[PDB]
Design a protein around this ligand. Structure first.
Ligand SMILES: CCNC(=O)[C@H]1O[C@@H](n2cnc3c(N)nc(NCCc4ccc(CCC(=O)O)cc4)nc32)[C@H](O)[C@@H]1O
Ligand SMILES: CCCCCCCC/C=C/CCCCCCCC(=O)OC[C@@H](O)CO
Length: 292
């Protein structure tokens, strides 16, 4: 429907603007050019690609255009790769924060500039590995829905391009949900809990205040991640566990897809926005750089 399209396009607009703003800030401000903010930048970059590429492809995938099955499958896989890199590089921020607060004596030695770039390379490789798996044969292209293609006015040699028609639900539940949503979530939760509880126990005051700040920033990332990603993936479980049941309605599918993309506007933007150094650099960019 047209409401889904517009909202989805508005999300794409917000995700580019905010995440360019994050990247711009690190580029200009010398005080922000540390290892931590490289994970912030990488995640922001992955978000820009979600806005420019993933979301327009996702709309098509969710509304339906005519295409060859493997071309239709390729576009779906592309959405998966880009949204996943968005997830993994955000997880890299959380892990960085764990090593910073809990193991400071090994932080600079362990999380070097070289290994930070290595970590981000691993994120993209995992994203391609997981995202493109259906291209290897774990897909529904062997049984094209020829009756649906007709109703959609698709030519022969083409199918109606719909995500769930080509990407199997067993892949989405057993592989994608586990590797991309559940594991990162639970990891980010475990990192948050440890920092949170350790900070409460001590409650010198400067290190403690930092620890509280980190906890609340990690709570927001985890809270929003779960809010944005769980609804869609939980729905995916329901479809998989009862494929005979009547499908979750179109409006619910759309809202859930929309929520998952909203993650790219809020993560890691709010994290950065909560660092006062970023917050003042943002104001500097708007007030001074663009306005004069
Ligand atoms: C790495 C993780 N990324 C993702 O999950 C990304 O993939 C996409 N997506 C993940 N599941 C899904 C998923 N079930 N359906 C779709 N679209 C198709 C929507 C749709 C479903 C069913 C029906 C028939 C309804 C009926 O019988 O009456 C019509 C449209 N996209 C997904 C999202 O864009 C997400 O951001
Ligand atoms: C933390 C990451 C988790 C990794 C575990 C991933 C492995 C899980 C294994 C699941 C068993 C299912 C594999 C079954 C492979 C099925 C491939 C196929 O021929 O297509 C069937 C589909 O078209 C049906 O819709």
């Amino acid at each position: 429907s047209s409401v889904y399209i517009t909202v989805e396009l508005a999300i794409a607009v917000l995700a580019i603007l905010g995440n360019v703003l994050v990247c711009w800030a690190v580029w200009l401000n010398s005080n922000l050019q540390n290892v931590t903010n490289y994970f912030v930048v990488s995640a922001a970059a992955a978000d820009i690609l979600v806005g420019v590429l993933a979301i327009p492809f996702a709309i098509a995938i969710s509304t339906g255009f005519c295409a060859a099955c493997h071309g239709c499958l390729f576009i779906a896989c592309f959405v998966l790769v880009l949204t996943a890199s968005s997830i993994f590089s955000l997880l890299a921020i959380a892990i960085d924060r764990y090593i910073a607060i809990r193991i400071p004596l090994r932080y600079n030695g362990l999380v070097t500039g070289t290994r930070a770039k290595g970590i981000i390379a691993i994120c993209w490789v995992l994203s391609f590995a997981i995202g493109l798996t259906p291209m290897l044969g774990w897909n529904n292209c062997g049984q094209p829905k020829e009756g649906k293609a007709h109703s959609q006015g698709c030519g022969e040699g083409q199918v109606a391009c719909l995500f769930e028609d080509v990407v199997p639900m067993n892949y989405m539940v057993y592989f994608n949900f586990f590797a991309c949503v559940l594991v990162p979530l639970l990891l980010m939760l475990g990192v948050y809990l440890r920092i949170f509880l350790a900070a409460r126990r001590q409650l010198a005051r400067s290190t403690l205040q930092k620890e509280v700040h980190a906890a609340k920033s990690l709570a927001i990332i985890v809270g929003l991640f779960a809010l944005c990603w769980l609804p869609l993936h939980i729905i995916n479980c329901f479809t998989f566990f009862c494929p005979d049941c009547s499908h979750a309605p179109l409006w619910l599918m759309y809202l859930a897809i929309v929520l998952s993309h909203t993650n790219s506007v809020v993560n890691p933007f709010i994290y950065a926005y909560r660092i006062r150094e970023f917050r003042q650099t943002f104001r500097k960019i708007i007030r001074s750089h663009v306005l004069r």
